[PDB]
Amino acid sequence: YVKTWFNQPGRKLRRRQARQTKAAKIAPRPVEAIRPAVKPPTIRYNMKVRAGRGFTLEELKAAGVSRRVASTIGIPVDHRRRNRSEESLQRNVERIKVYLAHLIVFPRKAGQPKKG
Amino acid sequence: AVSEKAGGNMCRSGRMFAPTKTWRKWHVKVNQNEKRYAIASAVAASGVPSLLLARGHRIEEIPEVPLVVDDAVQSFQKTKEAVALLKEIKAYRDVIKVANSRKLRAGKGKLRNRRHVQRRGPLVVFNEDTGIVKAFRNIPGVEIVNVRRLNLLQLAPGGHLGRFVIWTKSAFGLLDSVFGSTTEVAQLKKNYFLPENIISNADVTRLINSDEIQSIVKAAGPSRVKR
Amino acid sequence: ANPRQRNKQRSGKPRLTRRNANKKAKAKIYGNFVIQQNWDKHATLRQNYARLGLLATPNYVTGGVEKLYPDPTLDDVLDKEISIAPAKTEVVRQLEEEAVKKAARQSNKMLPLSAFEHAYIQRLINKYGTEDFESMAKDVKLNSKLFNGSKLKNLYIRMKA
Amino acid sequence: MKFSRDVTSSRRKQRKAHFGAPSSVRRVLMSAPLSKELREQYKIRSLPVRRDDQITVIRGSNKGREGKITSVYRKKFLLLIERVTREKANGASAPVGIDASKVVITKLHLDKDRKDLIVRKGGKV
RNA sequence: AAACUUUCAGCAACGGAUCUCUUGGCUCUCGCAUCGAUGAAGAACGCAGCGAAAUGCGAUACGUAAUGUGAAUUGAAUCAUCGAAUCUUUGAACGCACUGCGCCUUAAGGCAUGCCUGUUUGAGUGUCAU
RNA sequence: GCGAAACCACAGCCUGGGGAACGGGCCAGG
RNA sequence: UUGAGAAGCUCAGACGAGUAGGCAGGCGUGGAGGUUUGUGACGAAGCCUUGGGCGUGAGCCUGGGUCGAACAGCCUCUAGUGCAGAUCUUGGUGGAAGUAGC
RNA sequence: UUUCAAUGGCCCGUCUUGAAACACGGACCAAGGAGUCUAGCAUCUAUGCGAGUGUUUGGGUGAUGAAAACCCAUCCGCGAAGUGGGAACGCCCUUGUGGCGUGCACCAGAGCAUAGCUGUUGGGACCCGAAAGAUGGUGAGAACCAUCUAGUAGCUGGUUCCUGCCGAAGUUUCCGGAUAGCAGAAACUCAGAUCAGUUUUAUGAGUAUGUAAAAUGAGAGUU
RNA sequence: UUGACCUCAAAUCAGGUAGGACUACGCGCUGAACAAUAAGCGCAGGAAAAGAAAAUAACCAUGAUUCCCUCAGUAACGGAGUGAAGCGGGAAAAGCUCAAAUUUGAAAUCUGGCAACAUUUCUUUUGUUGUCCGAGUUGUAAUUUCAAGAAGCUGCUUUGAGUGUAGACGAUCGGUCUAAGUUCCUUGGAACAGGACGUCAGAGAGGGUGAGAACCCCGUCUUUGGUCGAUUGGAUAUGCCAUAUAAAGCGCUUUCGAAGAGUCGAGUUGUUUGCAGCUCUAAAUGGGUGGUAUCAUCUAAAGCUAAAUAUUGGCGAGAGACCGAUAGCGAACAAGUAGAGUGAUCGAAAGAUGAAAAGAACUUUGAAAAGAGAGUUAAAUAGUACGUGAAAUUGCUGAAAGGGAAGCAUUGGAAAUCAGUCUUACCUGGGUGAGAUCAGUAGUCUCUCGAGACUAUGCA
16 A cells, blocks of 8 residues: 555646635635634744634624624634633734724625615 | 556566556655756856857857847747747757757657657747747747746756757846855845855866966976887 | 446447646636736736735745745724725725725615504604603503613604604 | 647547548548639638549649549548549459549539538638 | 488578557546436347447337538438437336236226325224213 | 377497496597 | 877886676667767668678677668666576477377 | 588586586477565765755646746754874975974764665565465365465575676684684875794704794785 | 224325445445455445544643644554654635423414416426415424523614526537648659758647658647637626515623433443443533643534545546557457356457559369469569568478587688779979969958958959
8 A cells, every 4th residue: 555646746736726716706805714823732832823723702802893794704713712811812803903904895785675 | 557457477478577666766856956056057058159069059150158139039929030030140050950850759759659859949048928938939949938947957958068048138137136146145046055166267277287386396207208 | 448448449439528628727707897807817816916906815825935036012902993004006996996885875774664663653752752762661552562762762763864 | 839738649549530530520531722723712721522523633643633523432531533543454444542632622512501611711702 | 323311502381580560558647426116237139231259229220300510321421419209028127927827997007015294995892072 | 091199408339447427428449 | 299088198017717705897678868960762670691890708880682661879867678498488390200090 | 601631529507515426407499587666774975055954745836738847934854052193384415303283093063965886674575386274155075266365485496798807715712693714895004114834043941842133025014 | 873082004095215236435334364454244425434622731822624744653552563642834724503491472383285376407397376284282483502692771783585687707518710832853653752942830739641741631829719509607787576563793781591311430241442242320510531649621422514635436638758469458359259167257369461452354274272374563572371571390402421429619621602902193394275362453242451252354
């Protein structure tokens, strides 16, 4: 049993086309969602800042985005993670606010019945 | 590789000894600095007319080496414009050489989608493609490459240094950003410096027959001595 | 080699050839019309997003980017407000201008009262005054639906407009 | 050079396609060049050969011979021409087949379909 | 000498190496997702051209209709496309045996088993109400 | 008339000796 | 004096068995990149030959004959790369032998 | 080239054993036919960079072939944190003296990556040669079939071009080996020095034997 | 007696569904020899499985699953060997549905029949509306899923499971659009070769054509596109309807907050901590798992879920430093075929005339097979026993040698045959004419005054 990698260039191209196929479907919006900034959970890496999964409910509440609309504008929600320190809260609230400063949200049509 | 189900190596319709396998090592690694050294050394060799002649290029009427043309060449649209330019700088002798060299490949290669063989013509190097690639690609032997992604398979075909290269003015001006110098880093290659040489003046006859050295050597004995 | 593939070789019937092999081909853009008009079908999606003044990723990039030319304190974060951001290119300006003009057009968020709603609130106002809504809600006969003070206030507000 | 990956340059596959073509494909495979007068009058360089076409042999031993196309033998990629034959041992004249690319059409067997085909390939009738 | 034996050479046999070829194999990569009780895969028997030890087709038997291409095969086609029709006996194979032997209804329609939802007709010393 | 197969390094007259059989093959003879 | 493929040229002296084993330099084959502005229907490749030549050798060049479509030298890369044996594999063909015999 | 004359001249390959012999294999010819691929480890060499080094998990990118080439964000692997003496200077007619000594031996990092070579350990592992056993079937205890399975031979047989150069041991010691020794490679220093299947001088001990320092030859000692 | 309900039935009642095949890649139950392997058995799809923590950790904490790299050939087990995982870096990212709390001021829910109305990849497909019956209170909807949430109160922000039309942007399928020599000479059966003069190139890929064809033909490039057929994606714009007395997000609380049992677990036997059998059998700030050796973390015994991933099968496609007819699949052709076996199964050999059959008319011998005269072809030294035609082997002819180890080696003879080596030029003298690189010479062109190339004029 030997696993060959002759399809390594083919997989590189296939993933690139998936990125372009996705961008064709969603024309003006980014192909990835915004990820939070977290700290790896060990003494070896806790000084590094890496990308998280989603923003905590306390982060979203502070930034002014409700958890029901956060997913609609591309902000992932992590119900599992929590803010044990005020630094993680401030690092990711600013990340959300900067995200909302650069965001153009196109309006949607709404059904308005003629009567009351 | 042969099929696994195929097949003693001596018996007729048997199994070949040590059947070929796909997980043979096909690709071989080279240090990125060694690749850049070879590419820099192959660009330098293309600036020597004598190394061009020894690689088979008919550059005996070219006006200058390195040969740099205007940037209006980058926007040629028709092969007629491409051929006319090659005839004005007398670089069409190389193309004529390639056309006359087209033969049928000797061996089983022509049974395997390798019907014809020929020579390599001039290598046109450009900055931006606004027509230059399509105007030159049908000319036999001519290869067109961007100055940002130079290929050692094109700069030293066969492993032989000294390919005939025609640059545009913009490609030539950008050669100092692609490679840099020995003291200044390359702009387009992070932390890359051109290699230094273990010899300063490679003309060793200049050192041996210099006044600095010939004034201290003892009186030379004879050449081939008498018996 | 397989008996199925040998079977269709021996047949006099043509093969069900399909021609879908064209790599280097990038998906054409549907969805936004402004993006499609300004899209460059040759350039990659990163090159097109950057030219259009958009962000292909709100996060880091996981490799080296292409360099074509030799270029020459909790209180003040939860309470600060950032005044949006400039539109670098013309394409973003079209997207922004289109968004605001559609939001202004589809901005009627005031619901006028219906025949039943008008009569319901009118009977309550003409008996329990205008400024006292808590007493209006606590009425059981006129306020049969048992609307609270907030809903009766909204019925008043919608009646005015 | 070819750049589409929908066309194969494999000699194995190109020879298989030519020598295993159906008769509809073989109709276009055996095309002949029009004469200079017909080329400038019908605005067409070449056409598939058809019965009763008046042609001239350009290559081969029978170069210069004229005649109508008596039959288009598609199973062998050959054309049969009138009075372009070869004597046999017993005296019967065996017809000689000429490739369609080795003849030039000097007069077309025009019908309704051929006229529509002519204007289809940018051709003034 | 001659014969025979042996050697060498020429020619003729025998044999099928070598060379050249190649509508084949092998290997890698890429796209795609589509069998069957509306009878599949497989088997058998026929049909008509044949060379079948091949192919196509199913009693509408190289298929018919439709869309074409447009004059052959060797509205033509041993052509292409293909949405309509047809598709023998079998086979999960299904009325019972495995071609017979049957049943019911009007030659035709049918007539397998398990299970699910419903329909209808019944039975019960089942529990209750009158 | 039809028609094999096993077997096959290669030739093939004897007396003596060749030390490891020397012999059939070397040496000396008939 | 031209005799600097300095990897060349030149001078001198000595030495020469060889198993296992060790170390150099070469010959040949299939395919690949480069090259010979290479060879080829006015005859490629192969084959035959008491034709000629070159090399210590592996081998190579060539004349004639036959033949009918491709092929080679050089630099480098690559490998299913060189046979007299394996009671080797496949195929072809001998003596036995026109014998044993039917 | 064929033949003749004179002289010489055994049949190869394997195995055996002291070389043999002997016993094995070989009717003939053509074609096929046996150290390969890969993963580790170590050595040597080459190459790049060097207290660093390694682009190719992946991303970017590649308009024409796009499985190539080109570029690199964050990680990560490994690595790291007295004399003698080469060479040179200045004096000495020169030797020689004086000042200055690298490496190493006596008394201030060098690595990482790739490639090639060689050795070695695994994978069928140079090729071939004995039946296992098990699983699942067919036919009627036994038989037969197909896969695991390239399960095997401490062995048997075979293992494919040339030339040149070097060249053994074939056995002390303990005890399948660690050895030593024989034969090469590398790293050295060293004639104002040592070495020797050699002969000596005389006296020490018992013609032999041994001794330190003469003759002859060779440059030697080494790790 | 009748009716309601339950139960057991029956029916060729109506409407559905299952089986079998293929299994390269899924997932299960198994299971040897030597590997949690082969084989056996069961079940799927275009992927499957897994999956939104009864997960890690001990940090400044992370945050469903899957896959890759790394961790790491490490810890651990047991010296050998077996051999992970957390972190870290990437690919892709998406989250949710129930059970358990009274709609109780109203079973608000659903299948089926029948009747209309639409709709179609489609007269083949899908629904909608109305009515009746049935299901269902032993519980169908709305609401809730712990990340919460319910109920009140509150003033901010919100809202379509509708149906048309038009155009644009995409995807798929089928048509359509396409540059330039066959000019001259030579060889040849043939020009596609050689030479001359040309042409087109966003086309000098490949194949065909009587020998190496960019320009004879199909194609190739343009095409990452023009133009028409028909199908359908998501949106946009604009009408017509919109059952809103409605439904949501975010504030607040003098009010509430249900959480899965023959399961966890304990004991004992096997397989491999998991799983299973057996005996017993729970709890509610409980229970699981970790660090403490109290703290941390999670919330099981119910369910769904795209993408990144796999893929020797199937429907196609493009390739190759691969093999080149004893090779490469067993199979380039007839190939799982002929043939072998009661059967399971086993299983070959076998490619090439020529450009064109022009496949040898005709005469003649023979019973025939065939032969011989002829004839076709560029070639029959290409005649279907067919390209080339090696060796072993066989026959005839010619020459030579012959008596037993033989072949072979060395040296020459004889016979046969072969090879190359040639005097021809050099020097010198005159005569005759010639011309330039010579002119007590005139011009042009290209390079860098003079250097090459020429053009006239003279021949000292």
